[PDB]
Amino acid sequence: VRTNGAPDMSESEFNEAKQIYFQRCAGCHGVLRKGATGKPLTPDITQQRGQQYLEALITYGTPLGMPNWGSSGELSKEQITLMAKYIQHTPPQPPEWGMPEMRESWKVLVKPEDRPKKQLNDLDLPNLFSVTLRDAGQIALVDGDSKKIVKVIDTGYAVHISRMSASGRYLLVIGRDARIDMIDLWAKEPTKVAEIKIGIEARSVESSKFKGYEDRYTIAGAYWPPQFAIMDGETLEPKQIVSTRGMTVDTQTYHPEPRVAAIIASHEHPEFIVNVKETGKVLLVNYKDIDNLTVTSIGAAPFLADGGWDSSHRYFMTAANNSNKVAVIDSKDRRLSALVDVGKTPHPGRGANFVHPKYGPVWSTSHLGDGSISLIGTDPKNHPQYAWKKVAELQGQGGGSLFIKTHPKSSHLYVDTTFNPDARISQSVAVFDLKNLDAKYQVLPIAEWADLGEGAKRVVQPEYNKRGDEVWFSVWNGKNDSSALVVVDDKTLKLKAVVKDPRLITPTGKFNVYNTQHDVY
Amino acid sequence: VRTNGAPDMSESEFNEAKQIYFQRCAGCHGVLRKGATGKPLTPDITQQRGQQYLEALITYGTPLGMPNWGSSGELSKEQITLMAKYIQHTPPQPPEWGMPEMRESWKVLVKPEDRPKKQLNDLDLPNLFSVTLRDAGQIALVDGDSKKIVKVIDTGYAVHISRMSASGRYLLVIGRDARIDMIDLWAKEPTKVAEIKIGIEARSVESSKFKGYEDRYTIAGAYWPPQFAIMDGETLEPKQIVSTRGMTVDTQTYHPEPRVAAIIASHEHPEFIVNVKETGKVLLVNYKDIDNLTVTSIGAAPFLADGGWDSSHRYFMTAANNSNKVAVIDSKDRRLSALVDVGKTPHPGRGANFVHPKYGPVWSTSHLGDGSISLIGTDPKNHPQYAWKKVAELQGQGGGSLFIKTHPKSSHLYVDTTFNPDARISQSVAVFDLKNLDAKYQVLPIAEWADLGEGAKRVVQPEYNKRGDEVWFSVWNGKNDSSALVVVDDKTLKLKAVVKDPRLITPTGKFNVYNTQHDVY
Numbered sequence A, B: 001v002r003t004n005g006a007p008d009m010s011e012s013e014f015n016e017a018k019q020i021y022f023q024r025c026a027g028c029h030g031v032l033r034k035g036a037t038g039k040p041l042t043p044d045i046t047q048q049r050g051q052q053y054l055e056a057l058i059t060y061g062t063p064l065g066m067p068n069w070g071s072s073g074e075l076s077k078e079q080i081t082l083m084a085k086y087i088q089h090t091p092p093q094p095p096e097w098g099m100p101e102m103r104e105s106w107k108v109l110v111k112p113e114d115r116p117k118k119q120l121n122d123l124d125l126p127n128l129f130s131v132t133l134r135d136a137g138q139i140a141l142v143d144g145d146s147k148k149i150v151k152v153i154d155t156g157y158a159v160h161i162s163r164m165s166a167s168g169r170y171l172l173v174i175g176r177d178a179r180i181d182m183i184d185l186w187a188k189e190p191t192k193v194a195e196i197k198i199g200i201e202a203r204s205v206e207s208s209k210f211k212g213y214e215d216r217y218t219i220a221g222a223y224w225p226p227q228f229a230i231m232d233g234e235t236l237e238p239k240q241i242v243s244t245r246g247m248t249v250d251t252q253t254y255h256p257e258p259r260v261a262a263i264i265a266s267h268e269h270p271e272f273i274v275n276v277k278e279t280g281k282v283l284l285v286n287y288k289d290i291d292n293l294t295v296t297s298i299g300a301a302p303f304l305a306d307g308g309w310d311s312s313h314r315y316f317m318t319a320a321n322n323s324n325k326v327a328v329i330d331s332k333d334r335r336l337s338a339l340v341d342v343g344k345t346p347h348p349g350r351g352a353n354f355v356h357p358k359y360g361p362v363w364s365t366s367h368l369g370d371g372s373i374s375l376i377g378t379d380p381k382n383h384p385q386y387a388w389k390k391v392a393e394l395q396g397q398g399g400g401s402l403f404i405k406t407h408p409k410s411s412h413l414y415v416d417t418t419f420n421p422d423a424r425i426s427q428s429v430a431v432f433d434l435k436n437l438d439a440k441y442q443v444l445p446i447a448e449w450a451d452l453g454e455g456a457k458r459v460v461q462p463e464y465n466k467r468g469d470e471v472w473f474s475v476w477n478g479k480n481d482s483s484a485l486v487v488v489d490d491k492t493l494k495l496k497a498v499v500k501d502p503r504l505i506t507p508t509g510k511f512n513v514y515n516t517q518h519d520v521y
């Protein structure tokens, strides 16, 4: 084993590092090391740094995300030297991940027969918040009423998102390394009952949400290998694995590695909606019969990204990279209803739904560059003159917002500005009065409200509670600085509570059980 | 360009030979040259023969199938030298074949608007026979009544099979090189109206046979690339191309190159039944909406082969390589009804259906090794005690039969013995009296009946006429020897006609329009 410019090693050293890479590093550094979360670790870059620089970085780690492998004792001094050597060599082809490997990683910590037949705690589960602790590598269960952290669960290092099972009993979390952990909220102390790994890199997970199929199936989509898997919603046992490799929608030529951009459970039929990126296809995977799977392939647009349901939960509004068009998927009739041409490039996400006084039910989406927000009619039944058209456009504080949120019981539309260049703006949120949209938004000083007075204090993601009278926001501040969660009374737009705890390490995503379980947005 | 032991050439010579290989040679020699029709052309084999031996073979060709490229003027002296060099080098990875390449090969010789609005000839089309001329590289249209060759159509060199469109107007032929030719039987002189190439190697083609979809779609499945394509049943315009790459049914691990073993048009729903070999999956491709394709993936058995419909045309009886099990696919309910354990390994084919006096409707299949024939019950509605079970076993003359055939209006079951070691037996056929199956078959001296007195005079494939009172057989005898077609009166089991013509070069497959159009067997 010799690559063109750094440390010759060999085969009982290469394959060892290789194993560790795909199992412990690819989650953030990319399967081919082109990078994702972490920076790219290609040869040219790694060589210039030199063996020593590399070992220091791996052992100690950076406070901006990179774990410390030596200090934590996760890896050995000898192993860290192999990795430093390994990353300087040409990147090999990533391994496949089939049934043997999935079953290998499948572990049931608590058999279904040994789980509580009912809810063994006093927790108000529906108003619980599953807050992601980005750098701490875990999730925090926060009581929506007592406003205190109820339980801290260790997930992994690349904790990405949380999802709920249709019964409201199971908390599902996935990592960017394709590891999934199942949590039973009915135990004395809510805990992990099962886990499994479905690939090398992943971003999606969802449960069966069609009536009658509560807790029947759990699906997860990967970046690598190009595939998605359906597991038993009760034990996480891997049932079927499907490849997303195939022909593109535009050029209709073969594509060797299409990534699963997003997944969403359908309400119209017993099926999962899978967005495949490079091929531009929205797959409808029917799970009425898992032994003999039925899949409908809906051509949309190239480079599919994320999306969300319209108010009725029938039309899936989806964005595409480098495209000002929102592909509308009819999940009932299983077809492409439209390619709505909004102004600029829509920012990938669930979006926000509300009833515009003048236009009826609309679905909105923000624009990263100028902070504007596009509205689209989503009621062809009673408002056909507006259905599937950019009906209007709002204006926020400015650039770089990551989330927008509203609620059926609320009269406000909250929109952040996390990545705005102006520090002041990135520390606040805009609140739109849906009753008077001709008015300018109001600016809520979220960061000023906890109290922290240090760093960037980035403010991210508005999330309501079960009722719809409270709105929570995370107040970032990296590992060793101090973080908090701010709560506002939606009816009064006044501060209501500030959550602090030495355990609230870099809180980001917040998932209210009920609102996640029922797709309320 | 240097391979480890023969003629260094280079790149403007390599790529040229490479192009010619995949376009003109891969049809018979295999995409990786492992061989199929023709012998393998791998380096070790090609090197031992030496440049000179190779050039001689390519230029002159063998009478056992191999075309003469120099003599015919198809290739040049200079080009034949490159190929000789090319085949001695390590085999490269085969090219993909997407939409651009398919449209490139798509040629409409006669626009649909310019075709006759009605039948412009006196031909009795339903009783027409499309006889494959193996070495001559063409098909012969033979009148089922006048007993004379009505038209000879040039198809290509690897003419494999013929199929009919549901209207009975279009004759479809496919080559092992994935080239398809469409023939309009309504013209003054029946002729080609369109052609297209769908891959490098292929064996399957079929038309839409569900009521209402006459001439709507034509599908073709390939060996390489692993894909199938659906084209416009009127112009052969390529509409959709799907990849068969994916996970296996047994080990559920990724397979980079699964071949389409067979295709069959469904009668229960508007869908095509595609058998994928290595992954062991029976795909139900619904064409109600071609823009948004629905596919049901039925797991069967590993290494799927060919099959045929049961009498009702609802259950698809399919064989698998190295398996004594026949997978029964319910095409209505879209599931696997059974894995019938017949004795030995069933020989892949359509099979033969008839009503067994004691067991009711049965589907039969032969066994290459001992010439036995297995029977299986196919009526769970009125004979559930026999449905999906080896109900009985017949005995033929012996080893190596390729076809068995019966007909609803006939009381006989004809079975050949083409590859039997005993020359005498390979020149005859067995006729079973379905009214008395406890009796021994009768031996019809097919070869003795034309008159030829030379070579092996191999006898192959029993095919009835539109009525069901005649049974045709081909009487092989290679290129330069003399061939014929023998016809027997089914009601009398006596000779009825011998067809001879200097144009009947090595006749093999015979497809009666009506029986092919309606899947009568």
Ligand code: DHE
Binding pocket: A036, A037, A132, A134, A159, A160, A161, A203, A204, A205, A206, A261, A262, A263, A264, A306, A349, A350, A402, A403, A460, A461, A508, A509, A510
């Ligand atoms: C495609 C995708 C989904 C949909 C999954 C599904 O369907 O189940 C999703 C959803 C999500 C959702 C879903 C809930 C919602 O608020 O709608 C949230 C909050 C979330 C928290 C974050 N993720 Fe996520 N996330 C990515 C990908 C995705 N994020 C990235 O690759 C990206 C852009 C870069 C990265 O690696 O960080 C990214 C950044 C973030 C964040 O910045 C967040 C806010 C903070 C964090 O914890 O990393 N991801």
Ligand code: DHE
Binding pocket: B036, B037, B132, B134, B159, B160, B161, B203, B204, B205, B206, B261, B262, B263, B264, B306, B349, B350, B402, B403, B460, B461, B508, B509, B510
């Ligand atoms: C998988 C397959 C099909 C189904 C196609 C479809 O679904 O549309 C089929 C059908 C067929 C059918 C279908 C009709 C029938 O009689 O049922 C026939 C007669 C036929 C004439 C032949 N083919 Fe065929 N054929 C192959 C493959 C196949 N043959 C081979 O690879 C094989 C075993 C070896 C070879 O390359 O020759 C082969 C030999 C033959 C023959 O020996 C025949 C009899 C003479 C010839 O012309 O080559 N093929």
Ligand code: HEC
Binding pocket: A020, A021, A024, A025, A026, A027, A028, A029, A037, A038, A039, A041, A054, A057, A058, A062, A063, A064, A065, A066, A067, A069, A083, A087, A157, A158
């Ligand atoms: C995400 C959960 C990570 C995992 C797992 C690993 N790395 Fe990482 N790494 C990550 C980030 C976000 C960064 C950037 C750190 C920053 O604050 O700038 C890094 C950085 C490194 C480097 C970068 C070298 C440089 O460009 O300065 C190296 C060489 C590195 N990481 C190696 C590495 C290895 C070998 C890992 C597995 C054993 C590993 N990382 C895991 C995030 C994450």
Ligand code: HEC
Binding pocket: B020, B021, B024, B025, B026, B027, B028, B029, B037, B038, B039, B041, B054, B057, B058, B062, B063, B064, B065, B066, B067, B069, B083, B087, B157, B158
């Ligand atoms: C099928 C329609 C064929 C096509 C097209 C080509 N070849 Fe062929 N080839 C074929 C057969 C059936 C055989 C065996 C001939 C026999 O009677 O034994 C061959 C043989 C050759 C050989 C074989 C050398 C040997 O082992 O003796 C060579 C080198 C060869 N064919 C080359 C070749 C090339 C280069 C072609 C395309 C330009 C080509 N064949 C096409 C059948 C068919």
